[PDB]
């Protein structure tokens, strides 16, 4: 009652090929749903559309979320990572929950408990991979509120179906904590590939030796010239002079077309095309927007003004509203770095013959809007950001391809387990506060590169300003001014 | 060999979100104020529980080859056509209509991770918009593998 | 080694992305190597 059950640990230890980041925050857990389990569906919200239909349950439990890179990395630590390294990935995890303080509306309740458990069998719906709000704050001095746990299951309209499963979280064993008890657990990340925090210094089509002719031939002329019966077969050899027709081993990665929207509003068509012109996929009669979708370059060289409609991850700025905010409020990320191995999001993949030519038939070629996997493709996954998620859960299925998640990060069959917490019902008006420390060990891949000229680095702006970036203003509000991608250093393709 | 999976998912691919929480991601919600010349703008909104079709997702449903809802889908080998049977694993019909079946038993347990057999995989832009040209799309009648897909095998 | 607890990110020495006829600190078409600008060593920061 008079002794502390834990201390405040925040730092980062950079050791050799590994990184160890520790973060401690203060939290507040209110009594969600008056200790009750309430069914929820679009009908409770009115159910305006079939695409927006849902069915599920809301629970009194809260949960801890630290699925964003900012919870573990300061802006200096993230700069230190992305400038010096070719790759990283999580190895170990440690979580601690301590200094429990229960209140009653305000006085203390010493005899109340707080139930906490982890699901290590992954028997509950995993909500930590959907990029939800409620994460531990970027700035250590912020006291944050724990998000409520709720899940969804099979629906038909607003109605349920027989196969729908119902989950009571009180049906798990859970540790109970008075003001002197503490909760802790350790997690081992399963083996995942290193995130590639680098940008290629070569393009897939330029891999050739520019000084030498190939020994392979292509068809240069099909006709001798103007006239009748001019048909001929003329084969020039592919070489430095014409690099477009050379024979190549590998082809660019897959594509799914997206609409290009200009950041200069005068350029955009004067019509409402946000949903009608969007690229989507359909599942059981419902059309879900394709967001962000497969990894593709945001734009062609020299066109940074445009961005794919849904193809980018768009964050908010500090104090930005929920609905219909102005364009200067958002932060749009560009994925140009992968432009060397990946097709542009807003461009077609290529062309294919649509017919057989003959003396009576001219050669026809149609555009390829989407191109799935082909033997010999290579591609780059989406980049990870300081504001973006870390891991995702690979859906348990008979098969998958390249399970790496589409919002970026590490696809894991057994990701970090969900951490469920709630106040014990006693009802008496009650809430609890306390401390949370999370510690992840990261693995690093150093660059041995022989590049002669200096790299591109992430750097703080040189010029004076009213505020300094990634710091509090005069009111005490902390704001992240920009997104920070991971890819600066370069490799050979 | 892998164990054959013998269970039906209770969760749809597009409904893995926490219904109670907003996403920190944004989407373009408005392109025009409307009903006038030069009414152009970019308005963005939080993807959230009220609009669940626009939210960002880490995984997308499996590959598909279209079938006629009940003209046969086919594959050519050495010039000789062949019916596609049974073909890739897909949902036999959309939920609520049990009378229709693919041209070539029901698989409906897999409709969570797999596209309906007789439905298009989705839509893709076919052009660049501009002030002169409106946006266009076109239906995807077949989709090979893409990274980030998940699917169920066929039931035994 | 740099031990700093500074929260916000540093100034760093970085190459500029904007396109150019030549690469900085590289040969030109004639074979002549050049050094574009003087590079000092002071970028990271310490307290006084």
């Amino acid at each position, epitope marked *: 009652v008079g002794s502390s059950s834990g201390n405040w640990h925040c730092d980062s230890q950079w050791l050799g090929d590994r990184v160890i980041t520790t973060s401690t925050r203060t939290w507040a857990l209110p009594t969600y749903n008056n200790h009750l389990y309430k069914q929820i569906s679009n009908s409770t919200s009115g159910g305006s559309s079939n695409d927006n239909a849902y069915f599920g349950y809301s629970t009194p439990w809260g949960y801890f979320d630290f699925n964003r890179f900012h919870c573990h990395f300061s802006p200096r630590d993230w700069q230190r990572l992305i400038n010096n390294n070719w790759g990283f990935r999580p190895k170990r995890l440690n979580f601690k929950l301590f200094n429990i303080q229960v209140k009653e509306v305000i006085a203390n309740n010493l005899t109340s408990t707080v139930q906490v458990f982890t699901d290590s069998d992954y028997q509950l719906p995993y909500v930590l991979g959907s990029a939800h709000e409620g994460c531990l704050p970027p700035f250590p001095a912020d006291v944050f509120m724990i998000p409520q746990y709720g899940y969804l299951t099979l629906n038909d309209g607003s109605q349920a179906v027989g196969r729908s499963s119902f989950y009571c979280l009180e049906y798990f064993p859970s540790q109970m904590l008075r003001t002197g008890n503490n909760f802790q657990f350790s997690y081992e990340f399963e083996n995942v590939p290193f995130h590639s925090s680098y940008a290629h210094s070569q393009s897939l089509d330029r891999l050739m030796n520019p000084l030498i002719d190939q020994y392979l031939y292509y068809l240069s002329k099909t006709i001798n010239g103007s006239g009748q019966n001019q048909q001929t077969l003329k084969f020039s050899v592919a070489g430095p002079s014409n690099m477009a027709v050379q024979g190549r081993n590998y082809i660019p990665g897959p594509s799914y077309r997206q609409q290009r929207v200009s950041t200069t509003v005068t350029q955009n068509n004067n019509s409402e095309f946000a949903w009608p012109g969007a690229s989507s996929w359909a599942l059981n009669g419902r059309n879900s927007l394709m967001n962000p979708g497969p990894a593709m370059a945001s734009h062609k060289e020299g066109e940074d003004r445009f961005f794919p409609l849904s193809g980018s991850l768009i964050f908010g700025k500090q104090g930005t509203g929920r609905d219909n905010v102005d364009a*200067d409020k958002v932060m749009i990320t560009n994925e140009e770095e992968i432009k060397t191995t990946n097709p542009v999001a807003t461009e077609s993949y290529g062309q294919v013959a649509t017919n057989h030519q003959s003396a009576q038939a001219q050669a026809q070629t149609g555009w390829v809007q989407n191109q799935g996997i082909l033997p010999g493709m290579v591609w780059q996954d989406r980049d990870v950001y300081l504001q973006g998620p870390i891991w995702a859960k690979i859906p348990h299925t008979d098969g998958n391809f390249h399970p790496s998640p589409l919002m970026g990060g590490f696809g894991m069959k057994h990701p970090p387990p969900q951490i469920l917490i709630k106040n014990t019902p006693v009802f008496i008006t009650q809430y609890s506060t306390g401390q949370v420390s999370v510690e992840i060990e990261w693995e690093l891949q150093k660059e041995n590169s022989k590049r002669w000229n200096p790299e591109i680095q992430y750097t703080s702006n040189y010029y004076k300003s009213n505020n300094v970036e990634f710091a509090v203003n005069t009111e005490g509000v902390y704001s992240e001014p920009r997104p920070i991608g991971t890819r600066y250093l370069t490799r050979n393709l | 060999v892998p164990f054959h999976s013998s269970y039906a998912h209770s969760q749809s691919l597009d409904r893995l979100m926490n219904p109670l929480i907003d996403q920190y991601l944004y989407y373009l919600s408005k392109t025009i104020n409307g009903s006038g010349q030069n*009414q152009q703008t970019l308005k963005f909104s939080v993807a959230g529980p009220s609009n669940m079709a626009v939210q960002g997702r880490n995984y997308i449903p499996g590959p598909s080859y279209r079938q006629q809802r009940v003209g046969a889908s086919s594959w050519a080998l050495n010039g000789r056509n062949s019916l596609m049977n049974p073909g890739p694993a897909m949902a036999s019909h959309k939920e609520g209509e049990d009378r229709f079946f693919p041209l070539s038993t029901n698989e409906e347990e897999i409709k969570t991770t797999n596209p309906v057999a007789t439905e298009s995989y989705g839509q893709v832009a076919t052009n660049h918009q501009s002030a002169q040209a409106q946006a266009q799309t076109g239906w995807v009648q077949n989709q090979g593998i893409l990274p980030g897909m998940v699917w169920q095998d066929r039931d035994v | 080694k740099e031990n700093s607890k500074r929260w916000n990110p540093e100034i760093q020495y970085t190459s500029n992305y904007y396109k150019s006829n030549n690469v900085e600190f590289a040969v030109n078409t004639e074979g002549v190597y050049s050094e574009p600008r003087p590079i000092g060593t002071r970028y990271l920061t310490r307290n006084l």
Partner: antibody
Amino acid sequence: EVQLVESGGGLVKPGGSPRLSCAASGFNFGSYSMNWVRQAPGKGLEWVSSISSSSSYIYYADSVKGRFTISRDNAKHSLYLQVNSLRAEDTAVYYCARDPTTYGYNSAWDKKGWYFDLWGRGTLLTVS
Amino acid sequence: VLTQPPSVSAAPGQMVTISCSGSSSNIGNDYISWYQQLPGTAPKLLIYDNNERPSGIPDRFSGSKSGTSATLGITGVQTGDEADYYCGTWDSSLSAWVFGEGTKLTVV
């Protein structure tokens, strides 16, 4: 079609306070960044101030900084420049400039990349 | 600060080249635009995003940015093309928009 009209200009003695209103018509004034550019008689034009669509970002030139205030009204389709402590150097023709690009605030962090695609006729302001 | 030659003068049908030197903070860093102003009229945009040309602007006008300096090139000069020219960009050190000193083009 698209037009910008500047009014409020006239002859005012030094220390007087005037207010320059820029009325827009023909497009959606709510989604564009707005600017004030002045040109002193027989001299090159000078940028004065800028305001964002939501009027959250406001920049001033150093010469006018602290004595000039810029406000924008989206409902009345009007841009406002309030003037205080007028000085002889304040004689100019005040142009209302429109910036179509939002790219400085959402896609680029290092650079603004502004340009002015639409200009008002301008209103003269003389101090005597 | 953007620096332009105070005047340029060429006979009709002759190439005219107007260039304004800039510091690393402004021209090297940002896209530069060119504005041409007639004697009795307000400025009109000529070139934006270094080389891009607005609709209603003739092909003769062209622009390019190399290193810290951007040059506006006019070919097939005409009597009607005589007007003041300004190159402007956002300057990061100053944190304000800067216009060039101006360049008077005069055809004889």
